[PDB]
Amino acid sequence: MDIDPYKEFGATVELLSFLPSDFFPSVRDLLDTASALYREALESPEHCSPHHTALRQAILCWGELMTLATWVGVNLEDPASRDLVVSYVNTNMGLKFRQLLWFHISCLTFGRETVIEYLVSFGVWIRTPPAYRPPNAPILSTL
Amino acid sequence: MDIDPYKEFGATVELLSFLPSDFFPSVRDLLDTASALYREALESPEHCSPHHTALRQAILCWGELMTLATWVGVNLEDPASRDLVVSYVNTNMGLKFRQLLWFHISCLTFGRETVIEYLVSFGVWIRTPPAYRPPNAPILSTLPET
Amino acid sequence: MDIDPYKEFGATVELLSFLPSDFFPSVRDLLDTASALYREALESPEHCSPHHTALRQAILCWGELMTLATWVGVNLEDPASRDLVVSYVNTNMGLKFRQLLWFHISCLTFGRETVIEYLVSFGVWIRTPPAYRPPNAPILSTLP
Amino acid sequence: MDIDPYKEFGATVELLSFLPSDFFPSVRDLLDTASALYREALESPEHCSPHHTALRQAILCWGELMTLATWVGVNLEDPASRDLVVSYVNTNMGLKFRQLLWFHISCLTFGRETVIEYLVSFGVWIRTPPAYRPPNAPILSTLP
Amino acid sequence: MDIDPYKEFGATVELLSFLPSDFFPSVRDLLDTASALYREALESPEHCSPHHTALRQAILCWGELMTLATWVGVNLEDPASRDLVVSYVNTNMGLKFRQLLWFHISCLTFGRETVIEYLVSFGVWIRTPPAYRPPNAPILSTLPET
Amino acid sequence: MDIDPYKEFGATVELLSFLPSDFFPSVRDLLDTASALYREALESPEHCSPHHTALRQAILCWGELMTLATWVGVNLEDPASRDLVVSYVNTNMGLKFRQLLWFHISCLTFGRETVIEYLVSFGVWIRTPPAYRPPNAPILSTL
């Protein structure tokens, strides 16, 4: 169906590709940040924003993923397969979750215009050859 | 966190839980319906409604789920385990997907308040014991009332 | 070039595909219906509607294809190939023709918007399990 | 049913036949011209003109015929028949397509009435003996 | 990416592809014409038109191409290979340059709409088979019509 | 004909000379950035800007260069010459392409006034002797 996760929010998968995979923070940290700042809003019955809706969708599905992982951990009788499956869900389905959690949580804190402006600049920086790349990578701050 | 998918749309998991598993169409049928009616809107760069965004999210999630099922078999070489996992994903996570797809697709076609009223009445009906329940279930449709 | 015949009429090949292939009538029934209702209009000297223009072109095309079929029948000495080609024309191109004839003929009989709503609602009715849908298949009718 | 594709456009199959079969360009040249001038219009969501509707249907039909040709090429083991059928499609149906593409594409480029007058005047010019006609073949042009 | 050089100027590669290779002047003739008519504008620090900029770009590109041909011979010591490369650059990339130079130079002299109409009519003419084609091609020139 | 690529855009080859050759990013990265941010605009039939036109010209010619490189790779029967020619096109014609792609892509993102202001400042920095040159080289950012 050629659905793009970020197209509605004015970004593309290509634009996010500029950031390296390693850059995105760990799932636990992102979830803690989301809970700390937006738990009340996320659980509220009002539609605060589209981004809030997207974050809720991402959370509830990751939850379902961990549920299936728990399912293979308690049912599968093979430790070889048990390990393989769980490893594809925490590493391969986790790197996509990390990317979406970062975009939405960052668009909620900084603003989506700011988030997309940060994606172009980090791109310019990572493209800079190391001999000229400044030691301070771009960072999103509101101080 | 504790998130209810339908809370934002004015419904609860409890309200939808009364629908029996036989009620929802298959995943194929729902994805066909969603693509035929709303593909051009869902692919659009515009946020058409909270429901359109929810549908995109669910579609992407189901895609990632099916991706875990084509991946296995080219990685896991156990026939018994292969089946157990593939079955769990098409059955359990499958029924959860069918419920959400129906709600959003139906809230887009009929209207959200219409869908919620339908749910309330269908619940009154399914709660009636079969000896007293009228033999035909309610059917969801629009009204000319305005 | 990439064209849907339905795009100028607000429909899509996906929407027509939504209904099952078994639904559409035979080419004989559609051509008899089109002749009975609209022969005089189609043969008229004027652009009565873009539906008529499309229908005219399509009917001329099916005529040419049937001529090709007869030509193969009479010139092709090989019967295996003869059957293979004749079958392809009346199965694949037959179903492409049946779908278009139904759409245009039906858009002239019941109105375009009615046909689009019928396509959507019948497709959803076929998708719905029988226990939780109205018992009769949706049908187009002129009756009030 | 008896339909001319040209009747709603004020022309006739006789009038197109009036020009010699050698006159019309190849299918490749006509399809490239149609794509370059009008692809965006033909793919548009709207009935820009009955010329566009007709062109859309015709292009879809030629696509289907070329698909049939490829299918015969790959499935038909008999090469004599394979060649016979492929040749019929690109000779007979090819010339029926070339004539229609030229008419519609040309009616959009130069205007319908200009194309009808060109058909009449070029046909009479070809009929006229060379000693008593203007020396150059009539050609359509946008230039003032 | 997929970029068409003439798409921005209201023309397509298909529309210009009908001109035969004999139609365009030589590279020397086109560079002479461009320098004589428009050198002082092209060297100017002002953007005079999208076409003037396009001409500068094409000129610089052809210069870099010829630079690859004087470089070879002082670096490559193969007579057979030397020729193959030098020929490809003056013939293939040469005809591509001649087509673009003609379009911009002619769109600057005659006017863009005039050039496009000329192209359409010349195409109608070159598509006519020689038995029916009038013996003289159309010629591009201005009109007093206003 | 003494055409200067940047004269119309208010810059000179001398002003760009201030940046070192190594500074310019690799061709692949620049092309990816251009595709990610401006593919739709570049392929559009409207003249968005002169810079957009210049970028299209640069792209289509580099394409022709790679085409000729592919031509020497499939035709030349000499591996010595085959290597030499291809090496002059990816290194010598590539350093000029990199320079133009950077100027236009950067004038489109940051603004040409900003791009030319960055050329003077980097000049001041590279001129500074290493004992006093600050470790952070200038970088073009919109955050």
Please state, in angstroms and rounded to a whole number, the distance separating the CA atoms of residues B91 and E133: 70
Per 3-state DSSP, what percentage of chain E is helix, strand, and coil (rounded to 5)?
60, 0, 40
What 3 state SS string does chain D have?
CCCCCCHHHCCCHHHHHHCCCCCCCCHHHHHHHHHHHHHHHHCCCCCCCHHHHHHHHHHHHHHHHHHHHHHHHHHCCCHHHHHHHHHHHHHHHHHHHHHHHHHHHHHHHHCHHHHHHHHHHHHHHHHCCHHHCCCCCCCCCCCC
Q: Which two tokens stand for residue F2?
A: 């003494």
Helix, strand, or coil (residue E4): coil
Closest CA to A109 of A52, A62, A57, A66: A52
Please state, in angstroms and rounded to a whole number, the distance separating the CA atoms of residues D116 and D129: 22
Contact A84, A74 (CB under 8 A): no
Q: Which two tokens stand for residue E140?
A: 């591009």
Closest CA to F91 of F33, F26, F5: F26
Contact A103, A9 (CB under 8 A): yes
Q: Do E93 and F68 touch (CB under 8 A)?
A: yes
Question: Which residues in chain F are closer than 8 Å to E10, comparing Cβ atoms?
Answer: 45
Burial class (CB in 10 A: 0-12, 13-18, 19+), D133: middle
Helix, strand, or coil (residue E11): coil
Please state, in angstroms and rounded to a whole number, the distance separating the CA atoms of residues C6 and C54: 10
Q: How far is F135 from chain E (nearest CA, A)?
A: 36
Please state, in angstroms and rounded to a whole number, the distance separating the CA atoms of residues E5 and E89: 19
Chains near B (3 or more Cβ pairs under 8 Å):
A, C
Contact A18, A123 (CB under 8 A): yes
Please state, in angstroms and rounded to a whole number, the distance separating the CA atoms of residues C132 and B102: 13
Closest CA to E137 of E118, E113, E114, E111: E118
Helix, strand, or coil (residue C103): helix
Cα dihedral B33, B38, B44, B49 sign: negative
CA E61 to chain CA centroid, nearest Å: 13
Cα angle B21, B22, B28 (rounded to 5 degrees) comes to: 90
Q: Do B47 and A46 touch (CB under 8 A)?
A: no
Of A35, A57, A76, the CB nearest to B84: A76
Cα angle F109, F112, F116 (rounded to 5 degrees) comes to: 120
Contacts of C3 by beta carbon, 8 Å cutoff, 6+ apart: D42, D43, D55, D56, D59, D60
Q: What is the largest CA-CA distance in chain A?
A: 54
CA dihedral of D31, C105, C19, D57, whole degrees rounded to 10: 0
Please state, in angstroms and rounded to a whole number, the distance separating the CA atoms of residues D93 and E104: 41
Question: Which residues in chain F are closer than 8 Å to A138, comparing Cβ atoms?
Answer: 141, 143
Helix, strand, or coil (residue F30): helix
Question: Which residues in chain C are closer than 8 Å to B30, comparing Cβ atoms?
Answer: 127
Q: Which two tokens stand for residue A96?
A: 């996509």
Cα dihedral A56, A60, A62, A66 sign: positive
Q: Do B137 and C134 touch (CB under 8 A)?
A: no
Please state, in angstroms and rounded to a whole number, the distance separating the CA atoms of residues D115 and D106: 7
Q: How far is B24 from chain C (nearest CA, A)?
A: 8
Q: Which two tokens stand for residue E39?
A: 């050198």
Long-range Cβ pairs for the range A78-86 (8 Å, 24+)? A78/B78, A78/B81, A80/B78, A81/B76, A81/B78, A81/B81, A84/B75, A84/B76, A85/B68, A85/B72, A85/B76, A85/B85
Helix and strand counts by DSSP (H, E) for chain F? 6, 0
* Amino acid in the structure at residue E73: G
Question: Which residues in chain E are closer than 8 Å to F72, comparing Cβ atoms?
Answer: 85
Interface of F with A in 44-73 (CB under 8 A): none
Of B31, B60, B76, the CB nearest to A85: B76
Distances in Å between the Cα of D121 and the Cα atoms of D11, D102, D112, D127, D140 are 14, 16, 14, 10, 11
Q: Please, do chains F and A touch (3+ CB pairs < 8 Å)?
A: yes
Nearest CA in chain F to E12: F45
Contact F93, F65 (CB under 8 A): yes
Of B8, B10, B92, the CB nearest to A53: B8
Contact F66, F74 (CB under 8 A): no
Q: State whether residue A134 sits within 8 Å of chain B by CB.
A: no
Please state, in angstroms and rounded to a whole number, the distance separating the CA atoms of residues B69 and B94: 12
Q: Which two tokens stand for residue E52?
A: 């003037």
Question: Which residues in chain A are closer than 8 Å to B7, comparing Cβ atoms?
Answer: 43, 45
Q: Do A57 and B59 touch (CB under 8 A)?
A: no
Question: Which residues in chain C are closer than 8 Å to B22, comparing Cβ atoms?
Answer: 129, 131-132
Q: Do F136 and A138 touch (CB under 8 A)?
A: no
Long-range Cβ pairs for the range C15-23 (8 Å, 24+)? C15/B36, C15/C116, C15/C119, C15/C120, C16/C99, C16/C103, C16/C119, C18/B32, C18/B36, C18/C119, C18/C120, C18/C123, C19/C119, C19/C122, C19/C123, C19/C126, C20/C126, C21/C95, C23/C122
Q: State whether residue F137 sits within 8 Å of chain A by CB.
A: yes
Resolution of this PDB entry, in A?
3.3
Q: Which two tokens stand for residue D52?
A: 């566009």
Of C34, C46, C71, the CB nearest to D88: C71
Helix, strand, or coil (residue F25): coil
Q: Do C53 and D53 touch (CB under 8 A)?
A: yes
Please state, in angstroms and rounded to a whole number, the distance separating the CA atoms of residues D87 and D92: 8
Q: How far is E64 from chain F (nearest CA, A)?
A: 8
C-alpha neighbours within 13 Å on the C-beta side of residue E14: 13
Please state, in angstroms and rounded to a whole number, the distance separating the CA atoms of residues B76 and B73: 5
Distances in Å between the Cα of D135 and the Cα atoms of D18, D22, E135 are 20, 19, 9
- What is the CB neighbour count within 10 angstroms for residue D110? 18
Contact A71, A117 (CB under 8 A): no
Q: Which two tokens stand for residue A16?
A: 């996010």
Q: Do A50 and B53 touch (CB under 8 A)?
A: yes
Helix, strand, or coil (residue E102): helix
Q: Which two tokens stand for residue E9?
A: 């100027």
Q: Do A114 and F22 touch (CB under 8 A)?
A: no
CA E140 to chain CA centroid, nearest Å: 15
Helix, strand, or coil (residue A2): coil
Of A14, A132, A136, the CB nearest to F23: A132
Of C59, C84, C85, the CB nearest to D1: C59
Name the DSSP letter for residue E111.
-
Chains near D (3 or more Cβ pairs under 8 Å):
C, E
CA dihedral of E25, E28, E32, E34, whole degrees rounded to 10: 60
Please state, in angstroms and rounded to a whole number, the distance separating the CA atoms of residues A12 and B69: 26
Q: Which two tokens stand for residue A105?
A: 């949580």
Burial class (CB in 10 A: 0-12, 13-18, 19+), C28: exposed
Please state, in angstroms and rounded to a whole number, the distance separating the CA atoms of residues D99 and D30: 10
Contacts of E114 by beta carbon, 8 Å cutoff, 6+ apart: E140, E142, E143
Q: Do D64 and C7 touch (CB under 8 A)?
A: no
Contact C107, C115 (CB under 8 A): yes
**The tokens 């019929």 sit on which residue?**
D88
Nearest CA in chain B to C13: B36
Please state, in angstroms and rounded to a whole number, the distance separating the CA atoms of residues D82 and D68: 11
The radius of gyration of chain F from alpha carbons, rounded to an integer in Å, stands at 17
Distances in Å between the Cα of E97 and the Cα atoms of A23, E25, E41, F8 are 45, 11, 20, 22
Contact C91, D75 (CB under 8 A): no
Question: Which residues in chain B are closer than 8 Å to A69, comparing Cβ atoms?
Answer: none
Name the DSSP letter for residue A27.
H
Please state, in angstroms and rounded to a whole number, the distance separating the CA atoms of residues F141 and F143: 6
Q: How far is F51 from chain E (nearest CA, A)?
A: 9
Helix, strand, or coil (residue C133): coil
Please state, in angstroms and rounded to a whole number, the distance separating the CA atoms of residues A5 and B134: 45
Contact B36, B105 (CB under 8 A): no
Closest CA to F53 of E42, E39, E60, E57: E57
- What is the CB neighbour count within 10 angstroms for residue B76? 20
Nearest CA in chain D to E122: D141
Count CB pairs under 8 A between chains C and D. Answer: 124
* Amino acid in the structure at residue E47: H
Q: State whether residue B23 sits within 8 Å of chain C by CB.
A: yes
Contacts of B72 by beta carbon, 8 Å cutoff, 6+ apart: A85, B82, B85, B86
| Break positions in chain F: residue before each gap, C to N over 2.5 angstroms | none
Q: Do A18 and F30 touch (CB under 8 A)?
A: no
Q: Which two tokens stand for residue D97?
A: 């397509």
Closest CA to F82 of F94, F93, F68: F68
Contact D33, E14 (CB under 8 A): yes
Question: Which segments of F75-136 does DSSP mark as H helices, in order?
Answer: 79-87, 93-109, 112-127
Contact B53, A8 (CB under 8 A): yes
Please state, in angstroms and rounded to a whole number, the distance separating the CA atoms of residues F9 and F4: 10
Closest CA to F49 of E44, E8, A33: E8
Contact B126, B18 (CB under 8 A): yes
Interface of A with F in 87-116 (CB under 8 A): 114
Closest CA to A55 of A106, A110, A20: A106
Please state, in angstroms and rounded to a whole number, the distance separating the CA atoms of residues A114 and A141: 10
Please state, in angstroms and rounded to a whole number, the distance separating the CA atoms of residues A25 and C42: 67
Please state, in angstroms and rounded to a whole number, the distance separating the CA atoms of residues D24 and D106: 11
Q: How far is B10 from chain A (nearest CA, A)?
A: 7
Q: Do F8 and E56 touch (CB under 8 A)?
A: yes
Question: Which residues in chain C are closer than 8 Å to D78, comparing Cβ atoms?
Answer: 78, 80-81
Distances in Å between the Cα of B124 and the Cα atoms of B107, B129, B130, C134 are 20, 10, 12, 19
What 3 state SS string does chain B have?
CCCCCCCCCCCCHHHHHCCCCCCCCCHHHHHHHHHHHHHHHHCCCCCCCHHHHHHHHHHHHHHHHHHHHHHCCCCCCCHHHHHHHHHHHHHHHHHHHHHHHHHHHHHHHCCHHHHHHHHHHHHHHHHCCCCCCCCCCCCCCCCCCC
